[model samples]
Target: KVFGRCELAAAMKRHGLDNYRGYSLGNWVCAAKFESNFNTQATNRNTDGSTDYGILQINSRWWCNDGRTPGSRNLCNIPCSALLSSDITASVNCAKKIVSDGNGMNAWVAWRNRCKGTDVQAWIRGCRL
Candidate 1:
């Protein structure tokens, strides 16, 4: 599923990502835009041989068990393939754990590069959330 920016924002907020741990819904939306452009099926292989998966591009290493990531800790306790679904429930739950586990949003490089110190509200402008 390729979500529009506003649509993604609403979905994330519904899943309790809004103001989650101090990061706004816009921050998550911004990172998702940069990471996978809201595409549920997005995937990318890292230089270290791990892979990023699904909408938020959650990494194989330390997140999901993809079997080929070499050292995946499966912290999310889910198969990497689960993130590819348009449902986004698994994706959101896993993301919450990522932040809750003390990693914060910094777990996603895209968040640091694009959302950390910027006007993330722009990502959800005009969206009624």
Candidate 2:
């Protein structure tokens, strides 16, 4: 499932993305927008045989177990396939775990390159938050 900006914002807010780990709702929105365009089933394979899964693009190298990435840490303790569900709860929870792990949002290159040091709030400005 692909979400519009406001829809994504509302969904993330409902899942407690607001000020999560000192990151604002807009930060999450911007990351998701750049990482997967709010897509529930997005996946990107890296040259290192690791893969990024779901909207937040959690990585198999250290986050989810894809059963393919060598030396995967599976920190999230979930199968990468679980992240493809449209429910999004798993994705949100995993994303929170990523930040809580001390990696912060920098785990996502897209977020670091685009959302960082910028007005990320505009990504969710149209929302009623």
Candidate 3:
């Protein structure tokens, strides 16, 4: 699913993510933009040879298992492919769990490097959510 910004925001709201775990809805949207550009099927190999999956770009080494990733802890207890879907509720839930560990969006390197503290409200601006 190639989600536009508004579609992503609506889904986030439907999933109860507007203010989930202290991260703003814009924070989630901004992370998705840099991670997957709202493409449900997006995947990217990381510099460390692990991979990022889904719109959140969850890491292969920590939260998911892709088999090829040798040390995958898979704390989310889900197949990495589970994140690569149009229905991202599972991915969102897993991300919530990740944030529970005190990492917040810092769990995603892109968020730490790109989206954190930036003006990400624009990611959700045109959406009425």
Give the best candidate by TM-score: 2
Q: Per-model C-alpha lDDT, please?
A: 0.92, 0.91, 0.87
What order do you get sorting by TM-score, best first?
A: 2, 1, 3
RMSD of model 1 against the true structure? 1.0
- Note the clash tally of each candidate: 0, 0, 0
Off by over 4 Å in 1: none
Q: What is the TM-score of each candidate against the true structure?
A: 0.95, 0.96, 0.92
Look at candidate 2 and tell me the lDDT of residue 69.
84
Question: Over all chains combined, what TM-score does candidate 3 have?
Answer: 0.92
Among the numbered candidates, top lDDT falls to: 1
**Residue-wise C-alpha lDDT for candidate 2, range 1-129, written one tens digit per residue:** 999999989999999998998999999999999999889999999999999999998889998888888877988889999999988999999888889877799988999999999999899886887
Q: Could you report the Cα RMSD, in angstroms, for every candidate shown? A: 1.0, 0.9, 1.3
